[PDB]
Design an enzyme around this catalytic site. Structure first.
Site, PDB file in Angstrom:
ATOM      1  N   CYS A 276      -6.729   6.809  -1.575  1.00  0.00           N
ATOM      2  CA  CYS A 276      -5.878   7.240  -2.669  1.00  0.00           C
ATOM      3  C   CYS A 276      -6.299   6.642  -4.030  1.00  0.00           C
ATOM      4  CB  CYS A 276      -4.424   6.930  -2.359  1.00  0.00           C
ATOM      5  SG  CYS A 276      -3.782   7.800  -0.993  1.00  0.00           S
TER       6      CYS A 276
ATOM      7  N   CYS B 143      -2.971   2.537  -0.100  1.00  0.00           N
ATOM      8  CA  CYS B 143      -4.009   3.328   0.513  1.00  0.00           C
ATOM      9  C   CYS B 143      -5.262   3.398  -0.350  1.00  0.00           C
ATOM     10  CB  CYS B 143      -3.490   4.723   0.904  1.00  0.00           C
ATOM     11  SG  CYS B 143      -4.644   5.808   1.740  1.00  0.00           S
TER      12      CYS B 143
END
Lengths: 105, 105
Positions: B35, B32
């Site tokens: 992230c 991700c």
């Protein structure tokens, strides 16, 4: 039926296999509530709509594919045709999924 | 520094270790993008805020904890203090995250 994409190359086989048909891809995880809740509805839609290809990618098993597609929420529905991206839907909104299918099929 | 919760027992361990301190838990995935981008900012906050404990959970590695916490988007930040949930934040919104830290610490 909703086919389970095994890997990057299996993804690209299904995409080329799809001809001119819309492809809908469900990026999901087995531990994600909204994913589980919409999966049966996607399955039902897929049994009906033979002019559309329904696929799913388990993000924990296909981390590379998830990354390649900039996935951050689950489920994420990717709409494709002839290898091109048409749309994307974050979340389990069944009405929006149907709209997007209706628009892109 | 931000410690990676290994399993459920280890989560309890860290919650206890934290004492009375506010705990910020980052539910993330290696695939991700958002992230990856916010994580240095978190390491930075961890490094600077002595009254707050920062932890992280890899949803692919701790799928059980992810399910227990109803994670659907990453990053998702859980705010705990003395074992109790105070707040949550979906997505990589630093300012909100910071607001909730200042609010609950």
């Amino acid at each position: 039926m909703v086919y389970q994409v095994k890997d990057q190359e299996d993804f690209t086989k299904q995409l080329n296999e799809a001809g001119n048909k819309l492809v809908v891809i469900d990026f999901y995880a087995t531990w994600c509530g909204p994913c589980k809740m919409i999966a049966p509805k996607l399955e039902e839609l897929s049994q009906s709509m033979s002019d559309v290809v329904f696929l799913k990618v388990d993000v924990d098993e296909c981390e590379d594919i998830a990354q390649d597609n900039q996935i951050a929420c689950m489920p994420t529905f990717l709409f494709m045709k002839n290898g091109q991206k048409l749309d994307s839907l974050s979340g389990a909104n069944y009405d929006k999924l149907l709209e997007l299918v209706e628009k892109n099929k």
